């Protein structure tokens, strides 16, 4: 929601280094592995029976890139997160009935993946800014 200008710069600087072909799919894959009931919403994706099956699943990697693209849109619309995700909120809440705690889980898994990729560069202040971002995205997706 409200990031200080220095917080906004730090978040934007790190995001520009994100590998858009792996981080998204790894976050989704880890969600399906660490919180296995989430697999129920992805019955059309095929083999999710082992962690390697999940992380290697082409539909997981493909869909993970789409999720990561939505986070990028939220990052450029921190003032109006409710409007950017209003469509996506209707999809997840009225069509899919995803319990919103799962939104919080995915945001925290993404934060783990960012820590995994950047190591010591993912400092506690940078994490603190990202927790505000993912909380705001999760709140927007549950708005409806």
């Amino acid at each position: 929601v409200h990031l200080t200008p220095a917080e906004k710069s730090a978040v934007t600087a790190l995001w520009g280094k994100v590998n858009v072909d792996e981080v998204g799919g790894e976050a989704l894959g880890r969600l399906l592995v660490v919180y296995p009931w989430t697999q129920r919403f992805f019955e059309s994706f095929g083999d999710l029976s082992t962690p390697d099956a999940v992380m290697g699943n082409p539909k997981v990697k493909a869909h993970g890139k789409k999720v990561l693209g939505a986070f990028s849109d939220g990052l450029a619309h921190l003032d109006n997160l409710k409007g950017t995700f209003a469509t996506l909120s209707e999809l997840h809440c009225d069509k899919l009935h995803v319990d919103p705690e799962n939104f919080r889980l995915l945001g925290n898994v993404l934060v783990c993946v960012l820590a995994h990729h950047f190591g010591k560069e993912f400092t506690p202040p940078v994490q603190a800014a990202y927790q505000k971002v993912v909380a705001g995205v999760a709140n927007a997706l549950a708005h409806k």
């Binding site: 880890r30 592995v33 962690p51 999940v54 190591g119 506690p124 603190a128």
Partner: protein, 141 residues
């Protein structure tokens, strides 16, 4: 409920932590206090400045209690009974704060031990920390 594979994953991952346990515990605390400032209301007697010796000392205590929980993973209520008395009976910590510290610990391990933070180990560690959190927030005397 931990699987046999979970327990193996946790013991192997915690084995790689080694002498850095206290450092990781102090870093997880610092991450929690910064990311989730409401958690600081449980430590009003602490100097919470960056690099605080009090936070470093407490981080070592937290890490060593986790080490003890790893050692006694099939007998945690007995092994952690004193800590359950502290956190559930005396401090009355809201369970949400255990999710926050657990998340911050996972972030610290991912940042410092990337080769060890596989998806399977990530899952096993999350379950292990949830089980520890249940014991410390439960009154079972």
């Amino acid at each position: 409920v931990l699987s046999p594979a979970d327990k193996t994953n946790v013991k192997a991952a915690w084995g790689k932590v080694g002498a850095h346990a206290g450092e990781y515990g102090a870093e997880a605390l610092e991450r929690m206090f910064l990311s989730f400032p409401t958690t600081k209301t449980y430590f009003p007697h602490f100097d919470l400045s960056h690099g605080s010796a009090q936070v470093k000392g407490h981080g070592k205590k937290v890490a060593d209690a986790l080490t003890n929980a790893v050692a006694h993973v099939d007998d945690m209520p007995n092994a952690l009974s004193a800590l359950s008395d502290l956190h559930a009976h005396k401090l009355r910590v809201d369970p949400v704060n255990f999710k926050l510290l657990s998340h911050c610990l996972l972030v610290t391990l991912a940042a410092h031990l990337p080769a060890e933070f596989t998806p399977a180990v990530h899952a096993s560690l999350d379950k292990f920390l949830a089980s520890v959190s249940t014991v410390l927030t439960s009154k079972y005397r």
